[PDB]
Design an enzyme around this catalytic site. Sequence first.
Site, mmCIF file in Angstrom:
data_model
loop_
_atom_site.group_PDB
_atom_site.id
_atom_site.type_symbol
_atom_site.label_atom_id
_atom_site.label_comp_id
_atom_site.label_asym_id
_atom_site.label_seq_id
_atom_site.Cartn_x
_atom_site.Cartn_y
_atom_site.Cartn_z
ATOM 1 N N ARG A 82 36.647 -116.006 -10.540
ATOM 2 C CA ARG A 82 36.179 -116.011 -9.163
ATOM 3 C C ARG A 82 35.758 -117.392 -8.686
ATOM 4 O O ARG A 82 35.576 -117.583 -7.479
ATOM 5 C CB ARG A 82 35.014 -115.035 -9.012
ATOM 6 C CG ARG A 82 35.331 -113.642 -9.520
ATOM 7 C CD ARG A 82 34.269 -112.644 -9.128
ATOM 8 N NE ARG A 82 34.476 -111.359 -9.779
ATOM 9 C CZ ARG A 82 33.790 -110.261 -9.500
ATOM 10 N NH1 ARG A 82 32.852 -110.251 -8.570
ATOM 11 N NH2 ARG A 82 34.055 -109.145 -10.169
HETATM 12 N N1 LIG Z 1 41.677 -112.884 0.527
HETATM 13 C C1 LIG Z 1 41.866 -113.088 -0.780
HETATM 14 N N2 LIG Z 1 42.924 -113.832 -1.169
HETATM 15 C C2 LIG Z 1 43.121 -114.036 -2.474
HETATM 16 N N3 LIG Z 1 42.401 -113.596 -3.508
HETATM 17 C C3 LIG Z 1 41.362 -112.865 -3.094
HETATM 18 C C4 LIG Z 1 41.028 -112.569 -1.784
HETATM 19 N N4 LIG Z 1 39.882 -111.788 -1.734
HETATM 20 C C5 LIG Z 1 39.558 -111.634 -2.994
HETATM 21 N N5 LIG Z 1 40.407 -112.256 -3.871
HETATM 22 C C6 LIG Z 1 40.316 -112.263 -5.326
HETATM 23 O O1 LIG Z 1 39.084 -111.670 -5.695
HETATM 24 C C7 LIG Z 1 38.171 -112.676 -6.185
HETATM 25 C C8 LIG Z 1 36.826 -112.495 -5.528
HETATM 26 O O2 LIG Z 1 36.364 -111.148 -5.739
HETATM 27 P P1 LIG Z 1 35.179 -110.536 -4.845
HETATM 28 O O3 LIG Z 1 35.394 -110.788 -3.408
HETATM 29 O O4 LIG Z 1 33.878 -111.098 -5.405
HETATM 30 O O5 LIG Z 1 35.188 -108.980 -5.175
HETATM 31 P P2 LIG Z 1 34.023 -107.987 -5.618
HETATM 32 O O6 LIG Z 1 32.703 -108.468 -5.130
HETATM 33 O O7 LIG Z 1 34.435 -106.634 -5.042
HETATM 34 O O8 LIG Z 1 34.129 -107.931 -7.143
HETATM 35 C C9 LIG Z 1 38.842 -114.017 -5.907
HETATM 36 O O9 LIG Z 1 38.510 -114.976 -6.906
HETATM 37 C C10 LIG Z 1 40.327 -113.660 -5.946
HETATM 38 O O10 LIG Z 1 40.818 -113.611 -7.280
HETATM 39 MG MG LIG Z 2 30.933 -109.115 -4.833
#
Ligand SMILES: Nc1ncnc2c1ncn2[C@@H]1O[C@H](COP(=O)(O)OP(=O)(O)O)[C@@H](O)[C@H]1O
Ligand SMILES: [Mg+2]
Lengths: 487, 365, 166, 523, 152, 46
Positions: free
Chosen positions: D355
């Site tokens: 992330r």
């Molecule tokens: N718009 C996007 N484009 C590309 N990858 C995305 C996007 N949104 C999320 N990701 C992927 O998800 C990761 C982030 O996860 P996150 O938003 O924290 O989800 P959650 O909080 O539900 O676990 C990024 O590092 C990427 O791998």
């Molecule tokens: Mg999150």
Amino acid sequence: VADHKGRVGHVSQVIGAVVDVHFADGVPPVLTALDVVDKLGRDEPLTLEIVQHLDAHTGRCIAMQTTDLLKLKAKVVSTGGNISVPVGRETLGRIFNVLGDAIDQRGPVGEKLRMPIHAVAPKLADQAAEDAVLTTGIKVIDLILPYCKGGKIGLFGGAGVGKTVIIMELINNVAKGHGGFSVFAGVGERTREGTDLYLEMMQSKVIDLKGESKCVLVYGQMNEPPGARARVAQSALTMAEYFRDVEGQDVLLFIDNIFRFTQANSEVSALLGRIPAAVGYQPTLAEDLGQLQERITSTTKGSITSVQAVYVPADDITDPAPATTFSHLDATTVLDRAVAESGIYPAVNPLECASRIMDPDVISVDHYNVAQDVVQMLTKYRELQDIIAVLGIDELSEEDKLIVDRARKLVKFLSQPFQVAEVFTGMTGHYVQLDDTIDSFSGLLMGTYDQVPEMAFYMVGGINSVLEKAKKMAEEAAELEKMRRAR
Amino acid sequence: PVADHKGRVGHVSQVIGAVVDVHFADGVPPVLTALDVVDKLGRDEPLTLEIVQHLDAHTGRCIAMQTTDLLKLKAKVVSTGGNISVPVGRETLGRIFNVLGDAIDQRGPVGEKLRMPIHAVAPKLADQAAEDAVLTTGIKVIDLILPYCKGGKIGLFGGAGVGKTVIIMELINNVAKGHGGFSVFAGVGERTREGTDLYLEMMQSKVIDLKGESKCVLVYGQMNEPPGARARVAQSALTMAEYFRDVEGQDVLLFIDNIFRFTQANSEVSALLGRIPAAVGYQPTLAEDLGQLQERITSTTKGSITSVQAVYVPADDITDPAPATTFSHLDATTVLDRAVAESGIYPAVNPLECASRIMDPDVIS
Amino acid sequence: AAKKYDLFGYEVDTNTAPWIEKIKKCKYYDEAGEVLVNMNVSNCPPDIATYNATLQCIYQSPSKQSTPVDNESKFCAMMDLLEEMQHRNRLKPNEESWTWVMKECVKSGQFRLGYCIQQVMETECKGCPADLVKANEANAQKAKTEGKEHPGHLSQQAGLFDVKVE
Amino acid sequence: FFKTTEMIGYVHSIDGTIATLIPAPGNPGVAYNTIIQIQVSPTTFAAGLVFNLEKDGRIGIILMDNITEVQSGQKVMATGQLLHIPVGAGVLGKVVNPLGHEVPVGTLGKVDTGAPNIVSRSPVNYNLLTGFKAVDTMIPIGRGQRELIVGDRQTGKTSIAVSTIINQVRINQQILSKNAVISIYVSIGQRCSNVARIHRLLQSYGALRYTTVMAATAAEPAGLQYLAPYAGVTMGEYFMNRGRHCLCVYDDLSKQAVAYRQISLLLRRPPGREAYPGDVFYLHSRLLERAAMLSPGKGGGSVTALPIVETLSNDVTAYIVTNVISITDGQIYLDTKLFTGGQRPAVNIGLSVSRVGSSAQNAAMKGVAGKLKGILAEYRKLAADVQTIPMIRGARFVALFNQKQPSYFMNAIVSLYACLNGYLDDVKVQYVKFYEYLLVHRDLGIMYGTAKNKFFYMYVQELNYLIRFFTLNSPILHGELEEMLKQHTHLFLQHYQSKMNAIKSEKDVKALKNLLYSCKRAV
Amino acid sequence: FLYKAAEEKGNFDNILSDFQKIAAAASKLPIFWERTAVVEKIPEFKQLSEPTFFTLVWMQNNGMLELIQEVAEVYETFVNAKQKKAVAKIFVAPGGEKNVEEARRVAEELHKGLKELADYTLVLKTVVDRTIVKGFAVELAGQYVNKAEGQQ
Amino acid sequence: QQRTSSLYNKTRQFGITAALIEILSAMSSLEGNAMKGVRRNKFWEG
Ligand SMILES: Nc1ncnc2c1ncn2[C@@H]1O[C@H](COP(=O)(O)OP(=O)(O)O)[C@@H](O)[C@H]1O
Ligand SMILES: [Mg+2]
Ligand SMILES: Nc1ncnc2c1ncn2[C@@H]1O[C@H](COP(=O)(O)OP(=O)(O)OP(=O)(O)O)[C@@H](O)[C@H]1O
Ligand SMILES: Nc1ncnc2c1ncn2[C@@H]1O[C@H](COP(=O)(O)OP(=O)(O)OP(=O)(O)O)[C@@H](O)[C@H]1O
Ligand SMILES: [Mg+2]
Ligand SMILES: [Mg+2]
């Protein structure tokens, strides 16, 4: 026993984050706040919140800090009321904790009023009917599950599907130009995420240290004990309620993640002598969440647009916590891991999402008709995919393949690069207007773009961007043909 | 020296299954201490208890190695002055023993030089070996995909009627008979007839020379034995192996069948001890019990112990906590599948789920 | 003169003169990093002058530590220091910093790194000190004539089955 | 002038690795989560930790050492302080227990500190090179990041983390000690032998000088297994709060939870899911929140966490596994099927994610990784649904991801760039590793006397930092880089691939097979 | 309860004598007499004071007669606090209680250090500990001093 | 379909059981820790 301010008690039991307190003059009212004055050698003050009455003198409580270095028979003093948090415009641009103490190291905050975090929810008569579309600049949300101003929005998703990213995009698109104020509540999430949000908001001038800010942050995160994570949401909600009622302003309320509020109460439920319910949650799961959610509503005085992120453990949407939160929302956005694994972002499953304002009376007739046609086509396409795997694409009739070809473009055209995920994607984001999305999908359904290559719809904005990408695809293809021709 | 609590007198206060509470006026002896019931009670055999917990300064909870039939409250008990000790040395070679170390072969007295307690501390880090070599078993699947390591730890995970016991016998025939060092067979919760068949086979092969020098020791606590015995026979057999490894610097083979019954036995007593049970119903101390036992089964700088342990998978559920916890304590893992056997393939090894540590070019060719 | 502010808006100490004096009094250049560590802990971020002094100590120091350290290289340390300064601190190296690197390459006899640094100064800075360019070429001539231009094992003729893959 | 301790009561009951205490009437009393000493002899004491304080006055104690010496009725003394352990550079290269006691081989830091505040952190922008091309490209790791390593048994969970520690040895020797990466390897519930093998392995590569081991073997009581991660990170927080960077490895958190469950159930704490205690998430949550990247105002130090977690039959739906995944900033999923399929490390790129993103990659790696990511994404879809450029290069990238030892940054980045720009299109997939081996450990141009480059040669290891500064796609390095690759490709194809494709003899065929397999385990 | 009842009359030594009689009588009672107890029938308890006998019947009703040796300890603590007496426990080896001259000196030194017990009267109570073969230990108001050695 | 319907039923039947031994293990540990106290009854009046 009316005024219990200054009443004294003694600690009787300490097991984990749950502490039993004995008062000779009678236990104070439930939800009351207590300070452990006796100096125990701790680096941080210790405060407790009464949750139960074991008898006329004994009361069970949850601590907001770690119970380390706590001895029996230590001296407890009541604060004379529930936990209080500062309110007003003086809190703007500031970061707070569950107790309402600033942690930004930016000097004292001038507070003219404080309000308890626990309050009664609005009654039926205090409900306002506000049916107005909210334009988030996202093709999928604006089309299939449009959001309503003054309503409640849920982002259900597993881990790593993009719940946090979408919230950042919404803030960048809705909060920068918002007329009113904003409140962000971090609940049992990563601390670094909050830090990145704080930096981004300062860069976007939402939080203007030298000037005037227009947002508040309240953070109780994973590191904090379960007592803090079970009340931080109430504190931020209290601030929004004040802005709604006293200031009469239209406020935004972002929460990430609301599930942690349920998780924290489950952790302490075992030590409170409550038999676990199914899966392992507390028996009071529905009631505790309901009281909080009903407070998050738009009344006749003001409006609160609430966006809440919900964590679906192990991608099991049948879990009690995600399911119980579905009935307390006006617009649900369900994210699927399979969609993300296919490179589609945001990984929204339109077949599972829903919206209350998806009615012709509220939105334009063209908007309603286009959305339904898209959903029907996607549903039919999934049925065909089963055939395509057994028979093969060849066996499909002329009509079926046209549905397949059009549907695949719809699937890819729903994807959109966000302005906040440039590092993840490496491309600039797009902000698609509501009218452009409706027109773009309407033409696609009736075959106006049947000759456009499929990949031209992948990770783009409006129809104009699709044409430009198709032109670029044609040019590079011509160059490859020329290179092959020379060979 | 002499223990300060030997001869201490206590009285039985509570009896539930194989778990007995004993109250000592002068103070409960140390944990793991052994006690003997003095009252006749009309029993056909003596009654011995092992202390496992302290309820208070005077009361102690114990597990009985024999059946607790005809046991009344207030019965008199006397401390033995130490833990359960078993014979060691060459005198034990060619003999059959039980959990208490008493010979059951109906033959002459052991006449051991000394005895050592079953409970002992494991070798420390500085006393660990660094020798890797291949033990050739003559079986194609094992020697190819999951080769065994000399002085290492080997596990045969399998269901019921899959081939665990057969493979052990094949290994015994192909290795133990042609083995320079000594061998110890620890039967734990297995058929008694199998021990008898093994004893006859070892005599026919002259590994046990009744009139000459033998190379094998048998220790057996079987299904018929109460849970207390099945939870300690492995310790006693292991203690004999430790003596050969250290006091003599001799290579040892340790064939344990079945180790799962050891964990199962501790589960049965733990339920009676008044402990909240973990997942499935096993005791919360499942991992600790295995860790203490397995860590003693290792090769030190003084000697080497090659251990082969049969593991029973209940209901063919390999995710059960007992077999699952055992994987981390084994150098070589041999998983057997019922479906493979039903296809006529013997052995039923599932090579994909098998593993070995010496599958490294730096060790094997 | 003008107060600097950190990422979060808090001010940072700018009086970094005493630390530079401490750097210029070190014996082994590894001790210089300790001073930089103390500066960061004291919220006194290094400036361009501090990094240049650190490079000077590296060039003028006998060795990394009192006891020898295997595979120690002055050039690698200075390049890493520049990478930290430009990327993780947003400061453009000046002519002085690159000159120190070029001097180290010349002093150490690494005539191939000097060529790359020579172009860097000719690209980012304004040329290279002609004294050092000539010296670097001179270093090359020495091993150009000594049969040590390329390690010999590299030049050995090999084959498909004549290579020992360790 | 007496060494007066603070007696608080006696030992009432003992149940395995835990105990209960009855306080003597009219005594000061003991504080929660404090250390106490049980007087097993007039001169010998056993360590215990306070866990429960009941209404009756009884106290729950988690024993840590000298358990066999504990008996009912013994006296107990209260130190009145939390757990503090030795910390400093004097512990590196040593094996220690969670209590700080050193384990023979053949400053005090508090274990219950709070995590850094929100304003005390900074964005992750400094890379931590694992040495594996797959991870460093598709799964970036940045200092101050928590990157889970989740997989099934026997899939490389331990090896990859150990290799990551080893890969810092060469770097730490060259650069200043300011940017050196210290290592804290924590073994929990593992066999004592495996710790010894790891200790020898680290010693062989000289990693002990920058590494320390904290061991809580299986034979040790659950209390030590429960405190090992907290003690291990505490040793790593000493460097974080002093402008230095550290890397803490936990092998593994799955066995920590078992120990915590064992302790809780024995001390009569109500059970929960899979019999685990209710506050099992909060256990790991406060452990991993202590790993951060401090702001410039506090020193700029960091702690990087690589917790390890085991699954059953590739089931990531378990309880503790899900909790850890929701905490870390990314996950490396090691798949059993890939491991048996020859792919090693068996990193499942589809199920793996970081992330932090490109922010934790060096400027040189950003360009290569971004373009590489697009090619692989297409390659996965093309085969799932025809030799085109994405499909030609995608397979070669996969073959380049097979490794046995960490690779130096210069060697790895160069090889990826070559495959990216089509230099390996004419090279068969089977021979890619052999092509890479010659590129790194040999120089065809010098062998055949066709090398005209001035400085850019693969034997000049000092070029790694120049590459990491200017990028490969820069005028300073780009011109010579292309020339070297062009010469290497032409020479390799002409003199090696031609002969290799002309082999028919069984002896020659077998010899070639051994060579190529060896090349996989060499580069 | 026994302290409150005794406080009304003002005499506390009667209860202590009752416990002494109970301890002496229990030494002759059969094993596990607490579980086969009818205090009314037992003649040894017929000579006890009304508060003590009432308490004993109170325990027998709840089947908690095994707490006799612990309730007495609490009662003594209350009496000592009320009478302002500080008891120092001198732990000595079995048979080594002959020489306690140093123990008294150590106890006095500890008493002087403690400001709370300035007005309290010092008392010494000997206890036999089998864990120590030589030397002695002194405990007073939680302050424990060890000058003893055990088996080597 | 008769091998994934005999494992959809052997897995529904082990959930109803395993999730009831988990509620009834907590209930049994929330019951034994609820200690019985001294009864202030009239033992003389009987
Ligand atoms: N718009 C996007 N484009 C590309 N990858 C995305 C996007 N949104 C999320 N990701 C992927 O998800 C990761 C982030 O996860 P996150 O938003 O924290 O989800 P959650 O909080 O539900 O676990 C990024 O590092 C990427 O791998
Ligand atoms: Mg999150
Ligand atoms: N190698 C083999 N070749 C042929 N048949 C075999 C082989 N191994 C096992 N069998 C068959 O399987 C049966 C059971 O084998 P075995 O006695 O080893 O079971 P097990 O694994 O010890 O199980 P358990 O001890 O729980 O009964 C044998 O009686 C025989 O019919
Ligand atoms: N990259 C690799 N290439 C080839 N073999 C490897 C690689 N990584 C690990 N191995 C080998 O795979 C086996 C398992 O590795 P490792 O010890 O890391 O597993 P693990 O994840 O720790 O499993 P467990 O700890 O449960 O045994 C060992 O034989 C090891 O040498
Ligand atoms: Mg068998
Ligand atoms: Mg491992």
